[PDB]
Amino acid sequence: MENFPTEYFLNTTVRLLEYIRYRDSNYTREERIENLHYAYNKAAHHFAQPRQQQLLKVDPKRLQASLQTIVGMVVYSWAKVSKECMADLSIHYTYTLVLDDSKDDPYPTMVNYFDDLQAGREQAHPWWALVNEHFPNVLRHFGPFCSLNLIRSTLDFFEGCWIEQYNFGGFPGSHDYPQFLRRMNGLGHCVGASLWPKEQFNERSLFLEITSAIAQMENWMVWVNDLMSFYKEFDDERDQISLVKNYVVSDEISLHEALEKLTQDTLHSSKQMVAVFSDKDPQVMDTIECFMHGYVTWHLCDRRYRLSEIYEKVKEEKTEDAQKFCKFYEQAANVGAVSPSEWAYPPVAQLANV
Amino acid sequence: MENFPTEYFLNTTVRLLEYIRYRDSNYTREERIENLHYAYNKAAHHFAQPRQQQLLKVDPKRLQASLQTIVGMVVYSWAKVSKECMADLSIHYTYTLVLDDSKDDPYPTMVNYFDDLQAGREQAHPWWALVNEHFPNVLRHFGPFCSLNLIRSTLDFFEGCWIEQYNFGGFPGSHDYPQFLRRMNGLGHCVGASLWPKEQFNERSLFLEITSAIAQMENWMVWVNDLMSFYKEFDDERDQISLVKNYVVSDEISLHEALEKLTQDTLHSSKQMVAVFSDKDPQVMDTIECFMHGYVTWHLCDRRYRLSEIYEKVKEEKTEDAQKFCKFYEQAANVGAVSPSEWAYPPVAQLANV
Ligand SMILES: [Mg+2]
Ligand SMILES: [Mg+2]
Ligand SMILES: [Mg+2]
Prior knowledge:
- Chains A, B: Mg(2+) 3 binds at residues 239, 241.
- Chains A, B: It catalyses: (2E,6E)-farnesyl diphosphate = trichodiene + diphosphate.
- Chains A, B: Its cofactor is Mg(2+); Mn(2+).
- Chains A, B: Belongs to the trichodiene synthase family.
- By secondary structure, chain A is an all-alpha fold.
- The first copy, chain A, has a single domain (1-354), classed as Farnesyl Diphosphate Synthase.
- Helix content of chain A is 69%, strand content 0%.
- Chain A contains 19 helices and no strands.
- Chain A has helices at 6-19, 29-47, 50-55, 60-77, 83-98, 106-110, 113-119, 126-139, 144-164, 177-186, 188-193, 207-228, 230-233, 243-251, 255-277, 282-301, 308-314, 320-336, 348-353.
- Chain A is globular and about 60 Å long.
- The structure holds magnesium ion (3 copies).
């Protein structure tokens, strides 16, 4: 546990990419930049409005960083949706990412949650006030079924953040806690269902494939992020309650065994993704295919995950995995490494002061 | 379907009951009757009101049977809460059950779900109109955190019923579908959180134990019901899409292997329940202890699960399992076998016509 399991990590990462067939796509760099800028621009203007600037307590620099990371996530993974959809989704997922900065006990503001909701009064918690006011801009892109999924997952996410304020990784022997919490904060159904705008897909005609994608993508999605984040989190003494770390505490196993568990679930989830959707509606496999690749690309190109540090270490090694990794990484960079100055401007703060 | 694994059913059921050392002593015959009648009486008066009689489309006989089954469930398992709490919970879980066996398509009534919610307008779907109007009577018994859990779980349940209308057990190879659906319709967080009225428990002082109980009780609860109720759902059309049966379809394994999977999860969940809460706050272990026993007692007695039939077929067999099964089944009846005429009166229909 002293050193980072670099060789084990590379092997699992290469397997993950091969299982999902990571490969070049029709999604260019020019289109990338266009979408990045469109999504960023609309979002930046939104978060710069006085109402938002005042009810959303976030350090300007992090809001800027969080927005940029989210626009990147949406644009790179929701490759098939319209520019407006990427923009509105970027706003919503930026709201979720930001809420992780509040130490404010939701308790006082949640005392009248239901009565206020039923009466049509603005929620006491400012996050809810902005999120629910903006939600319709996100929901207009989806049918009733998918919309319900986005709504539920966001409600779950809120409770997840609440629970996480206690920095609790679960009582030893509480085996069901880890994944219980991970689903709470994962946004699985929100992500999964938001992949099907009614503009491109008929919710009723594809009810079964969509429901199935939500169910399978929920886990793939969160576990992939748990793994790709495993490098940056490794020595992060601040980050104390990740799925992997709660496995250690709750299941009473080594950090290493927790990481074995995570990669097995991840690889298996990847296989089944392919096995189930390969022969289904081609348009559905396309969206699923593009999300998995873009999602990994995003993790690979975003400084946040510092995976470039791993590339800079096996860059010249002559091992099988090390080379497959470096090639995948270069492919990723080839289309995903983009300078912020090419799309993320002007800064939110500059629009807020204007 | 074809032929019920009666033999194997006996073995699995005996293993669970034995492992959890099934024994109910939550109430003296007299307290059982008092609570049953109190809960039934308030609920019956509620469902007999003209508004309820009009928006709730349910065959009168079915409403009557469902109400009686639920009052029994609540009273027998929520042994530590007040009479009012049992009554209000009985009303809520009766609403869910009436939908649980229903056959309706939500799409047209869910098109304006969010906008109506945000504006404070009554929901288009009549079930939501009655449930949300009544909810405050249930929520007043809990703190904000637990309340949030009840609200979310009910929202999940609705989507679960929606999904089940398609009679889909999952695509072969979609291993994550089964439990995905089971949590949707399980009411796990609703049940788990509703075990802690603020009248008896401080939500903030026991935040960790309550959150943990919600996480562990979610699975224990649903799996126990899946095992105990495998019989009544086996041939029912509306219940052909269940956890055990979706395991067969989705994982491509024998009905028998699905059963072995279910009992292992159940036994293990039982083991960890004890391991984690034995030494924790005694009042918490008491509620957890009382729910598990009362819940099982309820299953061996309520009409809905028809476990009497399985008894009237093995009460002779010299199979050891059929013997251990009948000893348990008679033990349950001795404590919880109560004639409806001692509490469930007058009938809802008679109050409706008055
Ligand atoms: Mg159900
Ligand atoms: Mg049912
Ligand atoms: Mg059942």
